[PDB]
Amino acid sequence: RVVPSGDVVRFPNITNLCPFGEVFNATKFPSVYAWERKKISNCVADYSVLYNSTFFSTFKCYATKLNDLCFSNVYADSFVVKGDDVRQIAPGQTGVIADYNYKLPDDFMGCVLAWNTRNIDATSTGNYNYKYRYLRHGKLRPFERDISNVPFSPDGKPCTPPALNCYWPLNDYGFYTTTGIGYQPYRVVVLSFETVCGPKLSTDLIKNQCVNFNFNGLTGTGVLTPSSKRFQPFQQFGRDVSDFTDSVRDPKTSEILDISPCAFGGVSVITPGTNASSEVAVL
Amino acid sequence: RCTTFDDVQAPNYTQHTSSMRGVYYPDEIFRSDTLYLTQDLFLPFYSNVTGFHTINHTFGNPVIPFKDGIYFAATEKSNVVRGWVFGSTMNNKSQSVIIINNSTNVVIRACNFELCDNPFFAVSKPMGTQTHTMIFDNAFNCTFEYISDAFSLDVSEKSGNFKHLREFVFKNKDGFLYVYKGYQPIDVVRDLPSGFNTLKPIFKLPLGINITNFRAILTAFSPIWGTSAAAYFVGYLKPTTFMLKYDENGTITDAVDCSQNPLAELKCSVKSFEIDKGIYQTSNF
Numbered sequence: 001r002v003v004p005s006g007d008v009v010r011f012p013n014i015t016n017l018c019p020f021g022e023v024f025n026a027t028k029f030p031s032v033y034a035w036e037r038k039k040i041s042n043c044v045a046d047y048s049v050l051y052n053s054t055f056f057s058t059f060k061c062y063a064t065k066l067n068d069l070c071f072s073n074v075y076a077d078s079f080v081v082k083g084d085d086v087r088q089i090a091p092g093q094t095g096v097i098a099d100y101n102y103k104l105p106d107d108f109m110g111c112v113l114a115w116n117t118r119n120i121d122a123t124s125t126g127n128y129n130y131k132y133r134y135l136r137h138g139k140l141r142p143f144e145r146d147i148s149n150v151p152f153s154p155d156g157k158p159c160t161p162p163a164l165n166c167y168w169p170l171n172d173y174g175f176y177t178t179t180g181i182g183y184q185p186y187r188v189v190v191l192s193f194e195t196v197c198g199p200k201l202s203t204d205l206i207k208n209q210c211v212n213f214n215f216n217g218l219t220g221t222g223v224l225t226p227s228s229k230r231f232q233p234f235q236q237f238g239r240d241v242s243d244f245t246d247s248v249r250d251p252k253t254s255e256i257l258d259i260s261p262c263a264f265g266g267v268s269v270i271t272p273g274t275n276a277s278s279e280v281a282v283l
Numbered sequence: 284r285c286t287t288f289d290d291v292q293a294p295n296y297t298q299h300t301s302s303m304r305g306v307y308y309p310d311e312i313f314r315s316d317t318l319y320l321t322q323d324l325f326l327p328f329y330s331n332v333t334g335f336h337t338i339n340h341t342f343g344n345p346v347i348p349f350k351d352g353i354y355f356a357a358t359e360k361s362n363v364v365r366g367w368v369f370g371s372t373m374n375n376k377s378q379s380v381i382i383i384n385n386s387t388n389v390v391i392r393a394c395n396f397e398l399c400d401n402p403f404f405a406v407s408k409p410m411g412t413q414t415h416t417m418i419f420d421n422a423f424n425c426t427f428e429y430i431s432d433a434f435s436l437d438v439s440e441k442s443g444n445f446k447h448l449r450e451f452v453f454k455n456k457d458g459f460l461y462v463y464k465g466y467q468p469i470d471v472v473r474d475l476p477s478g479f480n481t482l483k484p485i486f487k488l489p490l491g492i493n494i495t496n497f498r499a500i501l502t503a504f505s506p507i508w509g510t511s512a513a514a515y516f517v518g519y520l521k522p523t524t525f526m527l528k529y530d531e532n533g534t535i536t537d538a539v540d541c542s543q544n545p546l547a548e549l550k551c552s553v554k555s556f557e558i559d560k561g562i563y564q565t566s567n568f
């Protein structure tokens with residue numbers, strides 16, 4: 001048998017791209033206790049508009065899910081962080097975000113794209129519409145939000161602030177434009193895998209070789225060459241007089257390839273005998 | 284606005300001969316220079332077709348049973364049916380499907396519909412423009428919405444004989460409605476024109492409902508909602524075996540029912556259409 005060498009994976013033209021310019025570059029994001037459940041479904045969440053950019057500080061995935069995004073109905077959860085809260089957008093990492101604002105697990109998450117919005121979110125005196133929680137009666141569980149400005153009391157007494165043992169849970173992030181890096185705002189989107197998928201890995205038609213392949217639904221080894229088989233417009237691929245697949249319309253460019261077996265066959269050895277020679281000719 | 288037909292007259296139930304129609308391309312696979320026995324839902328040959336003629340004020344469009352699949356065929360000049368209502372009870376109790384042609388495009392929704400008890404296509408008859416699809420007023424819990432390409436549709440009282448013979452195949456298959464279409468250019472006046480004809484696939488429709496019945500929607504041809512002369516036809520898809528012959532082009536030229544007579548099952552057996560004189564062992568009983 002002749003061992004194949006080569007890989008022809010072709011997919012169609014990619015279906016509906018997710019609006020990353022209007023979800024992961026949108027104009028209206030909340031704080032971190034109250035992530036915006038941006039429902040995107042039946043889409044291609046490819047990160048391709050954003051992974052090749054210079055906006056983003058983290059690229060932290062748990063935008064490498066440009067490779068490996070294929071999940072359920074994902075709500076493209078979006079939010080605005082403190083500069084010191086940028087690092088805490090991760091599984092675990094028991095700081096301000098995970099304890100009180102939004103806890104993140106280590107299974108159903110995508111990529112952290114944290115991009116600079118100093119001249120979009122912050123002012124010279126402070127954007128005081130964005131708040132973080134630093135105290136709550138109990139830490140959070142994963143993918144839970146808490147929008148309530150709860151009249152906090154650290155020992156269980158009924159609380160009407162600013163009375164005795166009464167704090168406000170929501171502290172302002174303090175988004176300046178004339179501060180250091182640690183108190184700059186990043187608009188961030190993190191995927192919650194609650195259906196979107198990734199882009200299409202597509203490559204060459206290495207014709208007239210024993211290669212592997214994987215078309216849009218058809219695998220195996222073969223030899224690829226164009227054909228004269230007049231497919232109809234509704235036709236995926238072709239079969240022979242018997243029931244094996246022998247021809248396929250290319251899912252991206254509609255070329256009608258032929259699919260032949262890779263190669264094999266028998267071997268004879270022709271010999272005059274050990275008493276006459278020790279060379280042979282194989283067949 | 285849901286209104287009904289007013290001058291509703293008695294139905295026809297005319298029997299027809301289904302001679303050589305209802306054959307279609309079941310898969311999306313190309314095969315050629317071959318001969319292929321397979322089993323699916325099909326029209327039995329020479330079977331009975333109930334015909335619904337539209338004579339002067341016969342509004343012969345009740346809720347018609349479906350059960351697995353149906354055949355719509357219609358000798359048309361004015362295309363008096365442009366709509367079907369799929370579902371079980373069709374009303375806004377369960378999810379139902381409307382597929383209609385509003386003379387601009389084919390608009391398709393699968394929702395809980397406030398259906399008219401007699402829905403229709405509001406058309407000025409001697410002017411020939413469809414004004415409204417008086418079918419549903421409100422839609423609820425919508426699951427799929429489709430709009431076809433925009434096209435100009437002849438909706439007037441066409442004179443002469445019927446020039447268009449569409450063939451339709453509708454299949455509820457695992458959440459999916461499959462809609463197939465064939466066509467014969469015709470010039471006919473009477474019962475049901477015989478002839479071999481094929482269909483092709485257009486639609487895979489994830490509507491996702493129960494469809495036990497369907498409702499035929501006539502076009503109201505009124506100058507009070509009225510008629511013009513047409514007829515349309517109802518057949519049944521049944522799970523039997525056909526053997527089908529493909530040319531070099533992969534086009535169906537010829538196929539054969541297995542269930543007609545012992546001649547036909549013999550042809551299904553030896554995989555040929557030409558059988559020598561002799562005696563042939565066939566299936567036991």
Ligand SMILES: *[C@@H]1O[C@H](CO)[C@@H](O[C@@H]2O[C@H](CO)[C@@H](O[C@@H]3O[C@H](CO)[C@@H](O)[C@H](O)[C@@H]3O)[C@H](O)[C@H]2NC(C)=O)[C@H](O)[C@H]1NC(C)=O
Pocket residue numbers: 530531532
């Ligand atoms: C599959 O479909 C094609 C249609 O594209 C069929 O090919 C056509 O066949 C006809 C007759 O079989 C050809 O007509 C011939 O034309 C020449 C000159 O054009 C004329 O001298 C002959 O007397 C005859 O009329 C036609 O040209 C041909 N088309 C092409 C593009 O070759 C084909 O026959 C179909 N396959 C089968 C098995 O029927």
Ligand SMILES: *[C@@H]1O[C@H](CO)[C@@H](O[C@@H]2O[C@H](CO)[C@@H](O)[C@H](O)[C@H]2NC(C)=O)[C@H](O)[C@H]1NC(C)=O
Pocket residue numbers: 012013251252253254
């Ligand atoms: C998938 O996309 C490719 C390119 O993005 C399409 O290739 C074009 O095809 C049309 C006709 O189908 C040609 O006129 C163009 O010249 C092709 N593009 C180039 C750059 O040469 C291809 O058609 C698309 N697939 C489908 C099924 O439409």
Ligand SMILES: *[C@@H]1O[C@H](CO)[C@@H](O[C@@H]2O[C@H](CO)[C@@H](O)[C@H](O)[C@H]2NC(C)=O)[C@H](O)[C@H]1NC(C)=O
Pocket residue numbers: 275
């Ligand atoms: C291989 O062939 C040689 C012949 O070239 C054989 O050797 C001779 O065999 C004959 C009879 O078979 C004797 O009369 C000779 O005396 C042998 N000559 C020698 C030099 O041995 C040999 O026996 C053959 N061997 C086999 C295993 O077939």
Ligand SMILES: *[C@@H]1O[C@H](CO)[C@@H](O[C@@H]2O[C@H](CO)[C@@H](O)[C@H](O)[C@H]2NC(C)=O)[C@H](O)[C@H]1NC(C)=O
Pocket residue numbers: 298329330331
């Ligand atoms: C279509 O239905 C008609 C009746 O509605 C069938 O015709 C009768 O069938 C019975 C039983 O087979 C016979 O005894 C009668 O002689 C038939 N009468 C006529 C006028 O044909 C008919 O067989 C049905 N079609 C098919 C293909 O079975």
Ligand SMILES: *[C@@H]1O[C@H](CO)[C@@H](O)[C@H](O)[C@H]1NC(C)=O
Pocket residue numbers: 559560
């Ligand atoms: C018709 O079939 C018979 C089978 O016995 C055969 O002998 C005969 O040659 C056929 N007819 C022609 C014109 O060949």
